[PDB]
Structures are given as structure tokens and as C-alpha cells.
Symmetry: D2
Subunit: 251 residues, 4 copies
Amino acid sequence: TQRHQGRTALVTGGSRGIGRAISRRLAAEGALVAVHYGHDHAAAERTVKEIETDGGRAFPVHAELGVEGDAATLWAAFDEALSGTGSGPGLDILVNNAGITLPRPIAAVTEAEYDRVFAVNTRAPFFIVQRSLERLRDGGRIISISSAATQTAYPAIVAYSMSKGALDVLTPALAKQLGPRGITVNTVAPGFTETEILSNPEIRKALSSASVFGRLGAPADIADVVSFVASDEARWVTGQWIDATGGVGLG
Amino acid sequence: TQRHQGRTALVTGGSRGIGRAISRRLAAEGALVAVHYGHDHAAAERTVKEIETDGGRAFPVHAELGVEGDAATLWAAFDEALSGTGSGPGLDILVNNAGITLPRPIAAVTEAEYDRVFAVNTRAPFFIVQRSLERLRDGGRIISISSAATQTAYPAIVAYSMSKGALDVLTPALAKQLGPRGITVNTVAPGFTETEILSNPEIRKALSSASVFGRLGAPADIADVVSFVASDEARWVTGQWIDATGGVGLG
Amino acid sequence: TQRHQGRTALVTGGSRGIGRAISRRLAAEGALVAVHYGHDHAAAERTVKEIETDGGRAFPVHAELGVEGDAATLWAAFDEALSGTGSGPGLDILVNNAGITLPRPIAAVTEAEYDRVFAVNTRAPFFIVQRSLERLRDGGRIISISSAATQTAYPAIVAYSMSKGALDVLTPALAKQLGPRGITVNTVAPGFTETEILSNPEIRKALSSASVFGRLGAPADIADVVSFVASDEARWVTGQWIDATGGVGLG
Amino acid sequence: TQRHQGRTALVTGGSRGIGRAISRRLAAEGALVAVHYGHDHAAAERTVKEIETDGGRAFPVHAELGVEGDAATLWAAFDEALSGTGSGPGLDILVNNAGITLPRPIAAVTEAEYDRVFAVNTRAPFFIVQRSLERLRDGGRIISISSAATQTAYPAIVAYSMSKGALDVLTPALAKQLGPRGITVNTVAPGFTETEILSNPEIRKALSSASVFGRLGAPADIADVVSFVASDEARWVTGQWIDATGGVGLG
Ligand SMILES: NC(=O)C1=CN([C@@H]2O[C@H](COP(=O)(O)OP(=O)(O)OC[C@H]3O[C@@H](n4cnc5c(N)ncnc54)[C@H](OP(=O)(O)O)[C@@H]3O)[C@@H](O)[C@H]2O)C=CC1
Ligand SMILES: NC(=O)C1=CN([C@@H]2O[C@H](COP(=O)(O)OP(=O)(O)OC[C@H]3O[C@@H](n4cnc5c(N)ncnc54)[C@H](OP(=O)(O)O)[C@@H]3O)[C@@H](O)[C@H]2O)C=CC1
Ligand SMILES: NC(=O)C1=CN([C@@H]2O[C@H](COP(=O)(O)OP(=O)(O)OC[C@H]3O[C@@H](n4cnc5c(N)ncnc54)[C@H](OP(=O)(O)O)[C@@H]3O)[C@@H](O)[C@H]2O)C=CC1
Ligand SMILES: NC(=O)C1=CN([C@@H]2O[C@H](COP(=O)(O)OP(=O)(O)OC[C@H]3O[C@@H](n4cnc5c(N)ncnc54)[C@H](OP(=O)(O)O)[C@@H]3O)[C@@H](O)[C@H]2O)C=CC1
């Protein structure tokens, strides 16, 4: 395709799972990809190596999210790492993908667990986007990775759903504000998606059967929607919540 | 009416504005109302006096929200204050009404301001509801006061909208979980509503014109919807987001 | 209550099922109710007798819907029947309740069946509302009875869902247009509701289990929401789609 | 791209406006395109010539919609026209694009005008899709062109909005039913879109300002979304309503 030819992307949690698929798709389409991660240096190196092997350009960016100064640390590492590539500052495509699950229903959730899922899932994207506005170019793309669970009730993950619900609400407000500069802002909401990290054949069967297609999502199913949203082909789609669940919750 | 005859209600921020209208309507309909507040002891006393003057029963409950132990402190004060009324423990109707605004667009929002609006608007209701489940009776009512701004983009208040968006997502998950005990969970979303705390005749005109009725909301417009949702007449309405904006954002 | 004291209501298909519950609730609250029907004169007489027995005022209005001149015939019979009561012309509350089911999936639907369900369910309400605007008073109420099936996919009734989907879209446009005269327009969407016309204990169990409350709806569950929407208590709710399904489709 | 290489598409009203842009985009990507139309033989010939000139394959299909036997006549002409191309029967991609406007508010709409807009906009697509199920292949695509007006109230076009609202409701029901064969069903909803058929500079300015981008849509903006939805890249998007309005109605 090369529909991201000459563009700079940042993918938060780009090292594994959906983030890795997004990182690899954007790079395969000609983007220079900042592969961000908080913990696993090795995973981040393999993902960059995979991209470089396939003929694309990527570099790691280390910043732990959900801690004091996380957003500032991420953009400092990005600016440094990016500068060290001999590219100019700023970016075209921001994907807030990094997130953590909290599989506890309301009676189980502690303050510590609640505070951590909001800090990573909601607070970090909010301040990451805030500082991106210093760097984000005209005709740019902001894409938040949310969850189908904001629109289909899942009591077992309620605090996680709420953290993604707050994130969903950032999209329309920013689409409106950034429209005059040709920037689009959109949410892509995955369903049950099979990553490198669904061992129970029984859970696998129940989650598969939730899709009208009778399968789990793959990272690639999400990355193919994100790549479209990030492209010029989606210039007329803004402020939206794009279901990437294989028809979960239809009937 | 007396459709809340013999029921115990808690209204968070019940001392002024929409909370006061809710408190007074529930009490006028026969509810015993816990009028909760964080700061203004005087306001809380006037509101209880107004209810007692009109023939109803209410008592103040002091707890500052958005601070360590807020939810535990609120339920301790409720249990104590309630016990001191010579009523039994527990409750029928929980209204999470207390909230604070943050009128700053994304480029303006500080960590401190963001953290405070989430702590009061989202975190406190979440842990308040969690501890209510020890006390909340069969056929009970949970009602969250949200904002029209979660569904109609208002960049100027983006972090406030996000805090209400997280709260919106708690409603369906809890409606599903609590259905088997006849409890309903619903969100009521006010529009531009004129409280005791809209001095600019120009802002007043612009916000009035947002309604298909060409006026600002009054606390009473919200309280009349909340009272219905809290009643047996709304037994078949659960998990919903009830627009109480006078038709803001229709076209 | 008497919250409809001195008001004139028309309920289409008011003779049985949800229409009968609406008719009886509005009359019990002091409304003069036009009980409209297309076919069963006897049912319409029993419903009016039931209202008159309980101390309320109602009269039958015969008009077959889904035929040439149906809307004109209904308003002619209403104006005549109403005039014969010695009340003045016009009305306060219009409920489009009359409808027919089409339980055939897409591969089964004939032109005749499709045309008939649209004629009764969509076309008749549209022209009925059009002629109501000559008669409908300030502060009035228009309420459409839709179906949960417009928002939760039910392939087995697809053409019926589409007919209700068109009806759903009339509500916001009219709420906007009629706001300046204090008229509200709203949709109430029933779920699986047990009428006089669910014999299979197996279908009964499956439809019951669709509700978070583990029961079928009763006409009264719908009528209690409609009566609220029709009242001054709902003056600030307009253009909305009110779920009256007992939490069908939440998760 | 060639992401429609070897696929057969039918585009209803493919001869001009959005239909022509869709027809040309699908053909440029390797689809064999049936360019359907009801009236203007010349327009249909120019559109096919444009495609053939650019290196693609298309053929005209004449059928007037909104008349007795329209769906049967369209598929007879398609099967004949298609057969005459020396391709096998059946298809991969169905776009219901053909539609007519009705710019009259409720007080203005006649039975004839109402009946005609439903016949073309709703009835024809419904029976066209019904007969497509005899021909539509595994992994296929059904795409309905709706209107932003189903979700943002436009009293001036109310009967048109209702016709598109019924069409919107066909999408989820069919997505659910056809999921097991890998077929996706989606609605694409254009905003104010500038076609060959917006002469008033004043209307042009007002409609432009409705978009967060301060311009009218172009056919190409819609065609780029439709082409994505029709492709393997959108395999995980089904039952959805895709806003192609340039952010109309966000705030
Ligand atoms: N998989 C699924 O079924 C679903 C996924 N989602 C959402 O999709 C997104 C991607 O999920 P998925 O692919 O499953 O996740 P994985 O857990 O597979 O990958 C998570 C990524 O985020 C990074 N990350 C995690 N926590 C932090 C942190 N505190 N600071 C910095 N980076 C962090 C990880 O790097 P590192 O380990 O080095 O920190 C890694 O790159 C998430 O937002 C998730 O909520 C939504 C619906 C369901
Ligand atoms: N008015 C409007 O136009 C709109 C209102 N809303 C929402 O409606 C709800 C009611 O708003 P409104 O009537 O305007 O508010 P007011 O500010 O008039 O009243 C706020 C109430 O909440 C209490 N409260 C505030 N902060 C705290 C705190 N930290 N701890 C404990 N109690 C607290 C206040 O008591 P004390 O001062 O003693 O702390 C008071 O009783 C809020 O959730 C608001 O966001 C939504 C849309 C618009
Ligand atoms: N019951 C349920 O589970 C559900 C009901 N609904 C909707 O709720 C509404 C009420 O349904 P319900 O109570 O079950 O219906 P019933 O069939 O019990 O009652 C139908 C009523 O409409 C009248 N009616 C029917 N067809 C015509 C016609 N052609 N002309 C004039 N009057 C007519 C009937 O009178 P007569 O027989 O004399 O013509 C009768 O008063 C309908 O719009 C229905 O689609 C939606 C979701 C599910
Ligand atoms: N343009 C806009 O701003 C908007 C458009 N839309 C929708 O997008 C779709 C495309 O609209 P647009 O490009 O503007 O339309 P145009 O009127 O430019 O093109 C209409 C097309 O449909 C065909 N058509 C029209 N009526 C019939 C009929 N009775 N039988 C058969 N074919 C027919 C026409 O061919 P022929 O003339 O030969 O019959 C032509 O190919 C429509 O469904 C429209 O409602 C929605 C929102 C706004």
C-alpha cells in the first residue's frame, strides 16, 4: 500500500499483542514507528527487529505508564529516541494502545487496583495526548484503543470498562477541537482478541461463540482497522467509536 | 404521591443545587433522606430544616469526597447518623449526585485538577456504590447524576466529561449484576441547569438556546426525573441513560 | 395522582394489551381517553366499560389502520366521538401504540406482508401525527410505542424491526420542531411483554431469561413509563428512546 | 491496491454522485462492477466508459426502483447483463446506494411523496437484499448507504430520515444472520455531500460549517470508506453504522 509513507507514528504498548500488530502494519505501510513499552525491553527489541527484518523502520521508547511524570518521560524518550534516528521532531499518528485489565467485579476491586487501572488506561493517554498537541502535525491521526466492554455490560471487569469509558469520551471532544487542522480523532474498540499473553478450551469456546463469526479476534483484525483509520482513506471519519469485535453484542 | 413512603435514601451533595431538589422531592414523597455534603455545614442544615418544615424527615451526613477513606467515612457517618434517627441500618435509594466541574480544555488541564475531578466524580461514586451493596435492599435504586457532555462534545470541559463517561459505564454492568434482586441502576444526565451557585446574560442566552424549549434547566426538572426513576413506576427501566437536558443536542 | 386531570388523550390500539393498560392508567389519572381500535368492537366496549366502572371517562374510536384514508378516518371518528362527549376539539396526549408483528426472517417476507407491516406500524402513525398537529395543544405529549428489536438484532422479525426503526427516527425531528410550544416527543420501547393474545412454556422461559429480572414484561410495566412520559414530571425529557424491556440486551 | 481483485460488485444508483464514486473506486481496485440506474441511460454509459477508459470492467444494469417487480427486474437484468459478460452468476459486494430525497417537513408531506420515498429508499433495498441471498458468496459484503439525518434531527426531511432509519435497522439483523458464512453487513452514513446534481453560496456555507473540517463532503470521501468496508481489511467490522460526515453533529 505505502499509505503511511513518510509518516511518524507512536504506538503505546507497541511491543506485544494488538500494539505489536499495529506497529508492524504501520511500518509495513512506510511509517517510522516508535514502539513504546513500560517493562519488557526484550519484547520491544524483538518487535523492532521484526519490523527492520521486513524492510521497515522502528525504534524502542521506554516509559512506564501509571506513575508520576509518565507522560513527560514518554515524550522526552520519544523526542530523544526520535532525534537519534536523524528524523525531525513531532509526529503524524498517535495510538494510545497500552492498557492493563482488572478482572474483578465491584465487590472485589481495591483502591490500589482501581487507581492503577485508571492511571494506566485513562490518565496516561489523557496527558500523553495533551503533550502530543505540541508535536502533532496537520492532517494527523489520534486513535484510542478502547474495549467493546464500554458498550456491552461485563460486571466481572467493571472498573476496567469504566477506565475505557472515560477514554471513549475524550475522542469526540478532541475530534471537534482538532478538525480545523485536518486531524481526525477516533476510538477503535477490540472484542475478545487472542494475544501472545485463553488457555482454557472452555473460555476459548465461550468467547469465540460471542462473535457472529464463531472465532476469537486476532491482533491483525484490530491492526487492519487502525491502519485504515490512520490513513487518508479515513479523512472523513472523525469522533467515532469503531467496533472491531467481529459482531460481539449484536443480538 | 407518597411513592417513597417508608424508604431510606442517601443523596450525595444533597445540600444545594440538583442534590437539594432531589433531597426535597424524595422527602416530600415520604423518604427518610440522608443529605450528604463535604464542606458547607450551614447549607446542609438549611436543606434539612426546609424538609422538616414541609413535614418530611432528613438528617445531615458530613463526608469530604476525593480524599483517602472518603467512601468508608461517608458510610460510617451514614450508619451513625442513620442509627441516631432510631431507623434500622441499610437503604432503598442511593443517588450519587456530588460532583465538581473542571472548565479547562485539554491544553489547560493540570495533573492536580484532573486527579481531583476523577477522585470526586468517578472514584468516590464507585467505592460509595461498592460499600452500599452491604446495605442496599431488594427492589432498591441506584441513580448516578452524569452530564449531557458525555454524549455531546464540549472540549472546554473535556476532563469533566471523561469523569462522567466512566460513571456512565458503571450503570449497565451494575443493572445486569443486581437485576436478580429487583434493584434498578440508571444514569440521569442533566443539561445546563441553573443552581444557587450564569450571571453573564450572554452565557445565560447561549445555554438557554441550546434547549429546544429556549430555557435553562431548573433543579426541579432533574429531581422530577430522579424521583420517577427511584419509584416503583420505573421498575422496568434499568441500565439506562435518561436525558434530562430539555432536548440539548437533538439537531 | 390525577397528573392527567382535565387532559384529552388518544391511544391507538387502546382496546387490548399494552394499549388497554395505557388507556386505563391515563383514565385513572383523570384523562378523557379516546380508545382507538381497527377490528374488535367488543374488546373496545369492555375496555371503555372497565374505565367507566373505575370512575374514569373514555369512549371508543373505530378506524382500521394500514388502508387508504386511515389517518383522515381516525381523526374524523375522533372529532365526531370527541364532539359527542360534549368536550371541545383537540387533545393533549397522542400515543401511537397500534401495531402488528411480522415473525418472518428476510428469506420468508412477501411484498404483501412487508407492505402491511409498514402501512400499519410506520405510515399510519406518521399521517396520524401529521393531522394531530391541527389539534395538539401547547405543553402536549406525543409518544410512540416502538420495540427493543430496533436496538437488539432479531433476524426472525427483521421487517417488523425496520418498521419500528423508521418510527424511532420520527421522535427526535418532531421533539426539535415542537419544543418551542412546550410539546415533548418520545419513544417508549417495550421488551417481551405478556398480553391477553407465550403459550409454549419453553418460549416463555427463554423470553423471561432475556430480562435481568427473569420475568416477562406486563402491560402495566409499559403503561407506568408512558404515564410518566405523558406527565408534567417528564417536561424536561424530549426526543428520547426510553427502554421499557426490564434490561433486555444489557450484556 | 487491487483489494477487490476478481470480485463482482453491484452498486444501485451507481451512475452518478456517490454511486458513481463507489462504482469507480471498486473497479479501480479490480472489481467487476454492475452500474445500476433507473432513468438516465446516458449517465450510466459515461460512468461505464470512465471505468473502461481507466483499465477496469463495468456494465450497466437498468431497473427502475419503487415500482411493482423492481427487485425481481433488477436481478433479472443483473443476471442477464452479468451472464453477457461471460462471468459466472452471483456476487461478492452489494451496495444499496440508490435513493431519493424528500425535503418537506411533516406538515407538507403527501401520501404519494411519503410512499415514493419509502418505496425507493427502504422497500427496494429490502427485497433487493432478499434476492441477493440466492447469489451472495461466502466472505461477501452488504453495504447500505444511509444518512447522518437518522442520528441528527432534521425536521425539514423527516420522511426521508425515517426511510433511512428503517434501512439502518436491517444492518444488525443481517450481520447476525450472515456472520456464520463470513459475510459482513454495514451501513455507511454520508453527511452533506456535493454531487453533480448547493448552488446557493449561503446553503453551501451553512452545510460546510456543519463539518468540523469546514467543507462539504465529496463523493470520493464516501467511496473511500465504502471500499474499506467492502475489503478483507474490514472482515472484523460487522453490523455497524459508519459515520462518513466529516464530524457532523459531534458537538
Ligand atoms: N486482548 C483483548 O482481548 C482486549 C484488549 N483490549 C485493549 O487493547 C489494548 C492492547 O491490549 P493487548 O494487546 O491485549 O495487551 P498486551 O498485554 O498483550 O500488551 C500490552 C502492551 O502495553 C504495554 N504496557 C502495559 N502496561 C504498561 C505500563 N504500565 N506502562 C507502559 N506500557 C505498558 C506492554 O509493554 P510492557 O509489558 O513492556 O509494559 C505491551 O506492549 C489494551 O488497551 C487493552 O485494554 C480491549 C479489549 C480486549
Ligand atoms: N448544574 C449543571 O448545569 C450541571 C450539573 N451536573 C452535575 O449534577 C450534579 C449536581 O451539580 P450541581 O447541582 O450543579 O452542584 P452544586 O455545586 O450546586 O452542589 C454540589 C453538591 O455536591 C457537594 N460536593 C461538592 N464537592 C464535594 C466533595 N468534594 N465532597 C463532598 N460533597 C461535595 C456539595 O456540598 P459541599 O459544598 O458542602 O461540599 C453540594 O451539596 C454534579 O454531579 C454535576 O456535575 C451535570 C451537568 C450540568
Ligand atoms: N407485546 C410485546 O411483546 C411487544 C409489543 N410491542 C408493540 O407494542 C404495541 C402494542 O402491542 P400489543 O399490546 O402486544 O398488541 P395487541 O395485538 O395486544 O393489541 C393491538 C392493538 O392495536 C390495534 N390494532 C392492531 N392492528 C390494527 C389495525 N390495522 N388498525 C387499527 N388498530 C389496530 C388492536 O385493535 P383491533 O384488534 O380491534 O384492531 C389492539 O387494540 C405494538 O405497536 C407492538 O408492536 C413491541 C415489542 C414487543
Ligand atoms: N448527497 C448527499 O448530500 C447525501 C446523500 N445521501 C444518500 O446517498 C445515496 C446517494 O445519493 P446521491 O449521490 O446524492 O444521489 P444522486 O441523486 O446524485 O444519484 C442517485 C442515483 O440513484 C439512482 N436512482 C435514483 N432514483 C432511482 C430509482 N427510482 N430507481 C433506480 N435508480 C434510481 C440514480 O440513477 P437514475 O437517475 O438513472 O435513476 C443515480 O445513479 C442516496 O441513498 C442518498 O439518499 C445521504 C445523505 C446526504
